[PDB]
Amino acid sequence: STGSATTTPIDSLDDAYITPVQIGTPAQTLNLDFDTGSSDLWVFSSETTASEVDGQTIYTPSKSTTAKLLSGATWSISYGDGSSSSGDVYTDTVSVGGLTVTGQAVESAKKVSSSFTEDSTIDGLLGLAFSTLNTVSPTQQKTFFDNAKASLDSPVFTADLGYHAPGTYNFGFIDTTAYTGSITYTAVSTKQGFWEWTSTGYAVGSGTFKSTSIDGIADTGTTLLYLPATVVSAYWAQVSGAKSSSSVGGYVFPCSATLPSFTFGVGSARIVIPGDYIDFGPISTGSSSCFGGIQSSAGIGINIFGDVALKAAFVVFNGATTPTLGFASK
């Protein structure tokens, strides 16, 4: 089997991407944030504290003839951005782009933090990291991909995120029309539960490539590119007037600037992030200070190849017995 679903930016900045997901019988379609940095499929629901729902579409398990309470199971998750959610668990039928999993754990939120409430466009998350990170207790649950894998034509999924445009998540096949050149594959460590890999270096604009190992994670659920402070300083030094602002929470730059590209290495291959992908717009409405899309990972404890990086590539998440990651230009 295979599946193919379009993923759509939630706003004009590509802050996140939503993908429609069918849950239950009859189907209830929710727009979920596919997150290769976490491993829980959780949704706003009829159980979510009413004051914490503000415009989201909810899953109502009592209206699904295939929903079953997973007795005694609870979940609770905290994300890198400080947001969180928790609740109980159902199993139900879940379909993405025509690919169906029966008995998928659907984690129903009883509580969500303010950032989730405040974002009316995201109805929940669909985790695509390794199932070892799943938070369900006392019996850990599998991700949608883990459950689907054996049925797939090939044990893979691909992320093809758009810049200010829709893109695609495919399951079970590689669309050879969706990229240019070849796909370069690179090793993955699953030791921390992430799609963790080592980039071979970087360049700023038309500058020379610096060969240096940068360990980080491929994370579709993180907006920006978080890299070591040395790398980030080298990038922003090429933008007149750019500075790190403690008050704003990162590097800012004059909105009048033209940003240089940023290249990262994948083995001997190179992925080029155009400068415009690094512009996250005014820090507040009407400001002429703009927020940068490349930020320091110092004090996160891990480097993160978030959407800024991933949307410059066609990315293969290869879930074979020994997982690997592939990157192609597009």
Side-chain angles (χ1 to χ4, degrees), residues 43-62 64-67:
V43 296
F44 279 79
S45 75
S46 56
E47 302 179 327
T48 310
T49 300
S51 64
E52 296 178 352
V53 183
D54 189 3
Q56 296 81 10
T57 296
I58 64 166
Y59 170 57
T60 303
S62 66
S64 174
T65 58
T66 41

Side-chain angles (χ1 to χ4, degrees), residues 4-62 64-67 69-109 112-141 143-148 150-190 192-242 244-327:
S4 181
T6 299
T7 193
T8 301
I10 65 166
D11 63 23
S12 67
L13 299 177
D14 297 346
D15 282 317
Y17 297 79
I18 50 172
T19 309
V21 178
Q22 283 71 50
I23 310 176
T25 308
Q28 299 179 40
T29 299
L30 275 65
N31 296 328
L32 305 187
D33 184 351
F34 282 24
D35 180 14
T36 63
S38 69
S39 306
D40 287 49
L41 192 175
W42 75 260
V43 296
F44 279 79
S45 75
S46 56
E47 302 179 327
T48 310
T49 300
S51 64
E52 296 178 352
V53 183
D54 189 3
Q56 296 81 10
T57 296
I58 64 166
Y59 170 57
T60 303
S62 66
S64 174
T65 58
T66 41
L69 180 72
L70 185 62
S71 182
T74 59
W75 63 279
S76 181
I77 192 162
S78 300
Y79 296 101
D81 69 352
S83 67
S84 64
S85 52
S86 62
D88 55 17
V89 187
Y90 294 81
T91 57
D92 209 341
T93 302
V94 172
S95 300
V96 176
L99 170 66
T100 300
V101 168
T102 58
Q104 174 64 46
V106 178
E107 303 173 33
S108 168
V112 304
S113 65
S114 58
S115 61
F116 288 115
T117 299
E118 290 162 1
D119 182 5
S120 68
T121 71
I122 291 175
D123 302 324
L125 267 65
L126 189 149
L128 292 168
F130 293 87
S131 293
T132 54
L133 295 181
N134 177 266
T135 78
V136 177
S137 178
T139 307
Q140 189 172 63
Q141 301 295 303
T143 70
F144 175 81
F145 177 56
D146 211 339
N147 283 321
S151 300
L152 294 178
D153 291 356
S154 180
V156 306
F157 68 91
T158 64
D160 180 9
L161 301 179
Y163 167 66
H164 293 356
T168 306
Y169 282 102
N170 290 331
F171 293 81
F173 72 106
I174 287 161
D175 179 358
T176 60
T177 73
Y179 58 87
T180 62
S182 47
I183 305 177
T184 296
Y185 290 87
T186 196
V188 165
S189 173
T190 64
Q192 295 190 83
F194 300 123
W195 293 92
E196 187 173 2
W197 64 290
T198 301
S199 172
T200 50
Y202 70 98
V204 176
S206 60
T208 63
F209 187 84
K210 176 69 171 183
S211 290
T212 182
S213 295
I214 304 171
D215 181 288
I217 66 167
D219 185 0
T220 58
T222 290
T223 313
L224 306 186
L225 174 54
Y226 295 89
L227 292 172
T230 48
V231 178
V232 175
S233 181
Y235 178 80
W236 289 108
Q238 298 304 311
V239 179
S240 296
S244 184
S245 168
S246 55
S247 58
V248 175
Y251 280 88
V252 297
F253 67 93
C255 295
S256 61
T258 301
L259 297 177
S261 64
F262 184 88
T263 299
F264 63 94
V266 182
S268 57
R270 305 290 179 253
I271 300 293
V272 180
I273 305 171
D276 293 344
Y277 291 25
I278 298 159
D279 177 18
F280 280 74
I283 61 171
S284 291
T285 303
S287 180
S288 71
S289 183
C290 274
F291 198 69
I294 296 177
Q295 296 294 345
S296 179
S297 63
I300 293 177
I302 198 161
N303 301 305
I304 307 174
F305 293 87
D307 298 334
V308 164
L310 302 182
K311 75 181 160 206
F314 177 88
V315 187
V316 181
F317 295 78
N318 170 27
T321 303
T322 299
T324 65
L325 273 169
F327 293 81

